Amino acid sequence: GSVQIVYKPVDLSKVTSKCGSLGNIHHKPGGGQVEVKSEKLDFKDRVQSKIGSLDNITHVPGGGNKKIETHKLTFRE
Amino acid sequence: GSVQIVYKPVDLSKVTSKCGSLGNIHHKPGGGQVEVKSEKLDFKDRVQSKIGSLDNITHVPGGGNKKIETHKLTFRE
């Protein structure tokens, strides 16, 4: 019958990503080749495709760290 | 003392390079990478160099053949 909840998810951090310098960083790719031959495609229900996705990437943050807190709750019945 | 030459280099040929068709020809390369680090170069006397010579080539003649006749002569003395 009766119910009582307490939910106090304290969190605390000091996420340091120190660095003095980066210097000579480079990204020097050569371009390859891709080819594809389908005939029919029927995508559905939360797709994220990548056909022929040639891609050269640089993702350099000066100081970096992702941080996640996925909280949830359910008391249906 | 006296001299007498005859030089009659007859030549005759029927160089056939027949073909009915070529069809599906392709040339599909991916681009690699090259790097070089010299400090000094002193070329001379009939050079033909190629530094970093990345190159994709197609050399398709429909019907082909070279043909060469390098004749010479000398009676100096």
Rama region for A41: left / alpha / beta (φ>0; ψ in -120 to 50; rest): beta
> Nominal resolution in Å?
3.3
Separation CA B70–CA B64 (nearest Å): 20
Would you call B33 and A33 a contact, using CB atoms and an 8 Å cutoff? no
Minimal Cα–Cα distance from A37 to chain B, Å?
15
Separation CA B64–CA B16 (nearest Å): 9
Would you call B28 and A31 a contact, using CB atoms and an 8 Å cutoff? no
Partner-chain residue, chosen from A28, A30, A33, that has the shortest CB–CB distance to B28: A33
Residue B54's Cα: distance from chain center in Å?
19
Radius of gyration of chain B (CA): 24
Separation CA B40–CA B38 (nearest Å): 6
Separation CA B25–CA B19 (nearest Å): 14
Separation CA A58–CA A52 (nearest Å): 19
Would you call B29 and A31 a contact, using CB atoms and an 8 Å cutoff? no
Would you call A28 and B28 a contact, using CB atoms and an 8 Å cutoff? no
